[PDB]
Amino acid sequence: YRYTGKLRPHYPLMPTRPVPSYIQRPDYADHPLGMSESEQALKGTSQIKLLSSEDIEGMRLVCRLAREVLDVAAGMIKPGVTTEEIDHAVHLACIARNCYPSPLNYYNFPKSCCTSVNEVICHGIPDRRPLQEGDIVNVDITLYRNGYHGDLNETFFVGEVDDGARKLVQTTYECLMQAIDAVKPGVRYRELGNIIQKHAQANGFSVVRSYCGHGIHKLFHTAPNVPHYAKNKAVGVMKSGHVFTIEPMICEGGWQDETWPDGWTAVTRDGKRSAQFEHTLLVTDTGCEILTRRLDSARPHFMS
């Protein structure tokens, strides 16, 4: 394999971390290939669930707990800390909150969260590499509680970063927030990508095309599919009671991605840096509720 940038995987991975039997498990947790029966039974479906009142309460709880866990990871972002160490803290924090770490064994993903440094667009596997001053790093958290998944991510700075890293991370966050601001009943899902790309393009940045936002509730990933680029062909119209993510991945150079031989790690083909932010949203009558918001601070971690 020819690597696209400086980053390399740092093996071996510590042995898989068990989840105590008392924590409720998603269907794929024990599947040998980590396949989700409940997901696959709906593969190829455009129909979007309308959440019930109990569904909404279940989503509010898990998305609040997921935010608490992301905040734990944020606290550890410093030079010299390995991504595996982050993952260990995240694993324990999910368990402490009576939650299963959703990524763990999801289609055989080996860890409890995704840590995506510099040119990694997404799905970086936590490993022995110590974080380096100047790095940017996304940690993507999903928890599973009482049958429901809650999903968020943020990009962080490791120590002091250069001007381009600041510009990329700020713009990616702006893209997400501008898209969130457009969410309300009657809006087509395909529209968010127009908003996101317009802002990214205006700042000299490209938009990843291979990975999308997603419906989430009793399923980790389900309808709607939500592209982040312009003139996409997404199917569906927002309605009150829809729950989905917007999770734009934005790049310094081109939009093209490829995957490492591990089958997971998605990287820029040019080896330039990529950043991502994510919230789980509930469409309401006035617009939408940001289920994964911070409750005690106005801003994401990279600002404060």
Ligand SMILES: COc1ccc(N2CCN(c3nc(-c4ccccn4)nc4ccccc34)CC2)cc1
């Ligand atoms: C035909 O059966 C399949 C169904 C789905 C998939 N996948 C794997 C799961 N998947 C997504 N996975 C992830 C992910 C996985 C592990 C850890 C963190 N994230 N993120 C996604 C985000 C958006 C859409 C899909 C996926 C969609 C494509 C493969 C085969």
Ligand SMILES: [Co+2]
């Ligand atoms: Co993912």
Ligand SMILES: [Co+2]
């Ligand atoms: Co997501």
Ligand SMILES: [Co+2]
């Ligand atoms: Co996520």
Ligand SMILES: [K+]
């Ligand atoms: K990254």
